Design a protein around this nucleic acid. Structure first.
Length: 117
RNA sequence: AUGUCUAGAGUCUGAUAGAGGAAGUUAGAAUUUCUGGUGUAAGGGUGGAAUCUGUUGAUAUCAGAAAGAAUACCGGAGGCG
């Protein structure tokens, strides 16, 4: 039984999966959840509905860590990232900032090759 | 074969644009690996799966260190050779 008050919620929303981590301001992780862990599999893992369920389950995991004050971090092009933020709002835990940490290189590390050569 | 001229072509003077070339320095983002924390059962991937990765602590997240390669935005019915 601890009280933190402040916190962060990281959300990675790629084309295959959604991962939601709830962590301190320092960044130390309190809990996490994922679409694969929420029982979905296959294309369901990347639908906006699965993102909504994953996020709200992640926060329900941490109902009793005495936090109501979060910074949202988003990366990835997934369709339902807005749904993740919307569900975080729907749970009633208030947000103070929304950010993106999507890595944009300065042209290094030549990427993968195209599909269907 | 020997002269003459300046409009062709050059030299000199002045102005000016440019990823032109070579050599020597420097930079940050991102990625990977390694080390140290938080934390748990998935991660990853496809039309759909599996191989693979992960309970020897993954993925995710925070901090530090190292190396390599390439230079987003400017940036195009551009510029130079």
């Amino acid at each position: 039984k601890r009280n933190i008050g402040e916190g962060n919620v990281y959300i990675q929303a790629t084309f295959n999966n959604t991962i939601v981590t709830v962590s301190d301001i320092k960044g130390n992780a309190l809990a996490w959840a994922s679409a694969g862990g929420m029982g979905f599999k296959g294309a369901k893992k990347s639908t906006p509905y699965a993102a909504q369920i994953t996020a709200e389950s992640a926060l329900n995991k941490v109902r009793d860590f005495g936090i109501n004050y979060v910074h949202v971090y988003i990366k990835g092009p997934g369709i339902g990232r807005e749904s993740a933020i919307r569900a975080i709002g729907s749970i009633g835990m208030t947000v103070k900032s929304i950010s993106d940490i999507t890595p944009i290189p300065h042209n290094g590390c030549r990427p993968k090759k195209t599909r269907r050569v």
